[model samples]
Structure formats: C-alpha cells, structure tokens
Target: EEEILRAFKVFDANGDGVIDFDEFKFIMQKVGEEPLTDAEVEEAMKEADEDGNGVIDIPEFMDLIKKS
Candidate 1:
C-alpha cells in the first residue's frame, strides 16, 4: 500500500487525485521489463476503471492494486 501510494503520487501529473494512462504506464514499467503495450494499456484500463469512467481514482486504483 505504501509503495503504491508513493508511485501514485509520482506519476499523478497534476496531483488531481487521478492517474492517467501515461502515468499508469510509468509504474508498470518500473516493475516489468518492457513498457506497457497499447493492448496491455487497454486491458489495464478495463481492470482499473471500477466505475467505468475511463480513469483511475483512489478507491478505483486501490481495487487495481488489490490493497483495499
């Protein structure tokens, strides 16, 4: 949870409490060898967007990380 929040702040861009697709790609790359592919990006969006709103908010993001 601490680690995810740290990365969440780093790539938040405007700190508006949301992480956009590019920001999402950043942290994902930190863990994986390659950057996120377009296909993977779309899949992640689906996995992370709990509300179907097309962006990841805090609670929604928590679901993505399975830390909630």
Candidate 2:
C-alpha cells in the first residue's frame, strides 16, 4: 500500500488529489509498463469508482487499492 501510494502521488499530475484516466495511464507507461488502452482504462476506472460519486476523490485512492 505504501509503495502504491507513492506511485499514486507521482501520478497525481495536477496535484488535484485524484488521478484522471490520462494520469493513470501516463504514470504506468513511464514506469515501463504497458499502459492500458482508452476503453480499458475507462472500463477499469468506472469499476474502481467505488464511492459511485462519478469522480474518484483521490484521497480515497489508497482506499480503492486497500487490500481485502
């Protein structure tokens, strides 16, 4: 979780607390991982939008990834 959060911060480009679709893919690509495609990202982001508030608040980021 700690490491994930670090990467999250690095990806939160606008410092706006939440990483939008572009931000998520950008960071992953920078790390040499194959960035997800447009529909893939959108589909995943919609699922990850747990609070169902339409926009992920970012502060809730770790919450989203918090292990079961």
Query: Considering summed lDDT, which 10 consecutive residues are worst modelled in model 1?
Result: 27-36
lDDT of each: 0.67, 0.67
Q: After the best TM-score superposition of candidate 2, give how far the Cα of residue 57 lies from its true spot, in angstroms.
A: 2.5
For residues 8-60, write the lDDT of model 2, one tens digit per residue.
Answer: 67777765676666666666567566785767777877787777366666556
Give one digit per residue, the lDDT tens place, for model 1 in 1-68. 77877766665666478777766666666665457476786686677677746777666665566754
| Superposed Cα deviation of residue 20, candidate 1 (Å) | 2.9
Instruction: Assess the local accuracy of residue 55 in candidate 2 as a C-alpha lDDT between 0 and 100.
Output: 60
User: What is the Cα-based TM-score of model 2?
Assistant: 0.58
Total backbone collisions, model 1: 0
Estimate candidate 2's alpha-carbon lDDT, on a 0 to 1 scale: 0.67
